[PDB]
Design a protein around this ligand. Structure first.
Ligand SMILES: CC(=O)N1CCN(CC(=O)Nc2cncc3ccccc23)CC1
Ligand SMILES: CC(=O)N1CCN(CC(=O)Nc2cncc3ccccc23)CC1
Lengths: 304, 304
């Protein structure tokens, strides 16, 4: 029993983190096989960030200008290329610690672990989610760029995020490992405002199921609702619309607890309208939305 | 910017986790040098747990009854001994992945990372704290015993906790790596109720300083207080008394923000008396107490 915001074990990813320096800037790179992936803004000066022409700036860079260090040993760069907003630095040595891996592009609502790094060295690990506005709420200081987000499926690491930017509002933006930004964000120091950060309804429901499984049941009520009625309330509270696909995804949790998905929706509807009244659910005074249904089943079943 | 409940990178500890089986029970062990540490209740049947005589039960066990597996390879047990509530299984092979380590006994209020494991395999990592009632609020299923709590200081892992028990109220109890339980708990299936789970005041203050550093400033007010006046309010709200030692520990955060510790105490006093009014601080609707002052400085400075 108990339910925590749990990250995946970070060891497999720690074995891939390297330091990348271009000129005076140092950030992190991800070393998989004989390729080091990093944000292309490593080539920029602070002046360049205002309106960078990355193809033009990259012409002035050679393999020997990209300093890649793995621990205290230098890697030899034998090629470089730009793929969207990431650089791929080909090195002469395959990472001996390369885990089984995949590059995946996640959807909003999906969670992942982040291994925050500075100078190619891991500082900490935390869990977050791709927000519906395509930002993430991370913990990143200067030097953290190139830190990655991932999920693990037994022994395969699915990398889904690489950190690139902090917006003026303190929220974060980045790319998948193909270098495509999530959402409309760009790697430029310009006015980029995020859209509405709606709540991930299917994840809140999953977390209410985790609460019931772990003994917190005070919020269960005598009501039910329909998807359409629930969605009228969800729209009012800036919650994402619940679809029949979400109801199907919640099936295993509904079966485990014996609480029909629409009955849990009615409990969530009352919590939205009535508030918590100073009470807590799984140690939280707000409705938590950064656990997917898969995360809840995984944590409640002890998948390793 | 941003502030997350961050755990230490778990790789160094993943390299130490093994499976320990005695009879029909399988739990986790911690392999450091040529010793595997695990809960002594691995020798118990479910009937034994009601009133176990561990010295007597251990007489019936030989080295060959303790099956220790590291990954898919078996370790040879050449000795066994009981130290308080842990067993130390001497193996014929030193763990080649043994990090620099220490065994420390933490005080209530101190935080640590837990690497939840099942069958010697890591499932996830999360952050928690030694509660003032000597319980921890973890996420542990059957099979998780022997999972450990730790802190890292650059390359030295300080192990502080080994998981042993879940109380009937869903909270957790365990030992340090010398086998001494935190608090009054015992490794017996008996009536063990926890005391008051008071809030760790110095940690709440540290987290309010993290909120100011990360831009959440709405709770700052025009007031100040004294330690004695603040403590009258803290006692009323089941908060731990704040001492001058806590004020001294908060010095670096006070210097960073320019907010005197007693002024922050006055902000905390108003939040306790007035509530949050539906507002949030660092994405929380309650006052968070599982970040120590050291955690706040570490996260806000990017220590690796
Ligand atoms: C060349 C240059 O000045 N830069 C700085 C800006 N960066 C982009 C950028 O947004 N970086 C950062 C990302 N995350 C957290 C951050 C905290 C603090 C400061 C910068 C952060 C490009 C490279
Ligand atoms: C021999 C035996 O039956 N046991 C079981 C009890 N254990 C003690 C015990 O409290 N274990 C557990 C610890 N943490 C989470 C847990 C969730 C679910 C169940 C058991 C948990 C001794 C060994």
């Amino acid at each position: 029993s108990g339910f925590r915001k749990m990250a995946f074990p970070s060891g497999k990813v720690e074995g891939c983190m390297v330091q990348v320096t271009c000129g005076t800037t140092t950030l992190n790179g991800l070393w998989l096989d004989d390729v080091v992936y990093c944000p292309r803004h490593v080539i920029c000066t602070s002046e360049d960030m205002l309106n960078p022409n990355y193809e033009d700036l990259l012409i002035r860079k050679s393999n020997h200008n990209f300093l890649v260090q793995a621990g205290n040993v230098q890697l030899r760069v034998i090629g470089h290329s730009m793929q969207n907003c990431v650089l791929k630095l080909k090195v002469d040595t395959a990472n001996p610690k390369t885990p089984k891996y995949k590059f995946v592009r996640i959807q909003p609502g999906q969670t992942f672990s982040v291994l925050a790094c500075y100078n190619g060295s891991p500082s900490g690990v935390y869990q977050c989610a791709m927000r519906p506005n395509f930002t993430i709420k991370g913990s990143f200081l200067n030097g953290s760029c190139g830190s990655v987000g991932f999920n693990i499926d037994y022994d395969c690491v699915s990398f889904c995020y690489m950190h690139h930017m902090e917006l003026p509002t303190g929220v974060h933006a980045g790319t998948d490992l193909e270098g495509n930004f999530y959402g409309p964000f760009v790697d430029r120091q310009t006015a980029q405002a995020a859209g509405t950060d709606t709540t991930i309804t299917v994840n809140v429901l999953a977390w209410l199921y985790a609460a019931v499984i772990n003994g917190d049941r005070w919020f269960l009520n005598r009501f039910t609702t329909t998807l359409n009625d629930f969605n009228l309330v969800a729209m009012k509270y800036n919650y994402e619309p619940l679809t029949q696909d979400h109801v199907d995804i919640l099936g295993p949790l509904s079966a485990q607890t014996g609480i029909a998905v629409l009955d849990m929706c009615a409990s969530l509807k009352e919590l939205l309208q009535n508030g918590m009244n100073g009470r807590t659910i799984l140690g939280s005074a707000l409705l938590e939305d950064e656990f997917t249904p898969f995360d809840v089943v995984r944590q409640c079943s002890g998948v390793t």
